[PDB]
Design a protein around this ligand. Structure first.
Ligand SMILES: [Zn+2]
Length: 37
């Protein structure tokens, strides 16, 4: 069939947070983290 490995999506590293949209991942580390070296 087709069903098998689900996911094929990247997630934030610093934290274990899962998003729905691609942009959400960006806007996330944008402020939620904003970790300045
Ligand atoms: Zn994060």
């Amino acid at each position: 069939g087709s069903s098998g490995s689900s996911g094929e999506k990247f997630a934030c590293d610093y934290c274990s947070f899962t998003c729905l949209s691609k942009g959400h991942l960006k806007v996330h580390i944008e402020r939620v983290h904003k970790k300045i070296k």
